[PDB]
Write a structure and sequence with these properties.
Macrophage Migration Inhibitory Factor, binds sodium ion, 4-stranded mixed beta sheet, globular, inflammatory response (chains A, B, C), binds chloride ion, homotrimer
């Protein structure tokens, strides 16, 4: 029942709060209904990026999850995640993409095996 | 209207020309037929990479797009993008992979919703 | 004949042993049955990451492969790859996710074209 979230951004490392990974973990756990133990998070600052040809702060993100992905859920996650990026990283929400992936258990390895 | 392109390479940051992000944005807008406002680009130099076991210059790239992906289109994008990587970054085309992804609109979040 | 493996980890660059990229290339060629020429590897240390809310050593990885992906194969790759991350990088296997992707040939660009 793994899930993982990655944020790639041009904002500098010093502007990513030290608690941001834990905030994301906790908020995603609540949003997906998964124990936080199952959630992994990866933040990549200082990237060379443009969004719409401009290099104001932006983010390209991905959420890969075994289940809990779908049209309505994804609309809800986008509000959650845009809110977090807007407040903590000062990124305008119209400069964020989030790609959503519903992963089959057989296609997620963990602990020397897969979830299937 | 969304598309996003990432290039990961071992070539050094100093060898990425000024204007490269803008060139990628404009060339991708033209190639995909999408307005530049919704094209995002991400260039990641100085990576620890090998291609065929060799650490000569190489790249691993991804193009995620809502539509505009398919057999003939992807061949055209590959000629365009390998050409740019060869000309601008001096990477041989046979040391480049580009993964193409046709994203469902429901699976791309942007500005507090999805594109669905 | 293409496959590509990325490992993102918080472990420091200096802890990645000399030859790790070569070992990954060789072992992935053996495991997938593909010529080593077409195996690409990408190792990304020093990342800002958490797994289950802990920032102890962890990894998020992906294997994209034209074929050679499936239930039994992915279990085998996970045992191989988690074993390598444990032995070489000292990452507990229960702090690793590996996402597996079976790529269509038409969706992998290489050498100014695609594999389709
Ligand atoms: Cl804040
Ligand atoms: Cl899947
Ligand atoms: Cl535009
Ligand atoms: Cl086509
Ligand atoms: Cl080569
Ligand atoms: Cl999709
Ligand atoms: Cl094969
Ligand atoms: Cl850490
Ligand atoms: Cl192990
Ligand atoms: Cl753990
Ligand atoms: Cl595919
Ligand atoms: Cl040729
Ligand atoms: Na290699």
């Amino acid at each position: 029942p793994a899930a993982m979230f990655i944020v790639n951004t041009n904002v500098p490392r010093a502007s990513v709060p030290d608690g941001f990974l834990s905030e994301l973990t906790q908020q995603l756990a609540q949003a997906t209904g998964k124990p936080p133990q199952y959630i992994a998070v990866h933040v990549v600052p200082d990237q060379l990026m443009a969004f719409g040809g401009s290099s104001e702060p932006c983010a390209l993100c991905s959420l890969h999850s075994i289940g809990k992905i779908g049209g309505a859920q994804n609309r809800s996650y986008s509000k959650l995640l845009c809110g977090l990026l807007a407040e903590r990283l000062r990124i305008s929400p119209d400069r964020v993409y989030i790609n959503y992936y519903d992963m089959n258990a057989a296609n997620v390895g963990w602990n020397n095996s897969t979830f299937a």
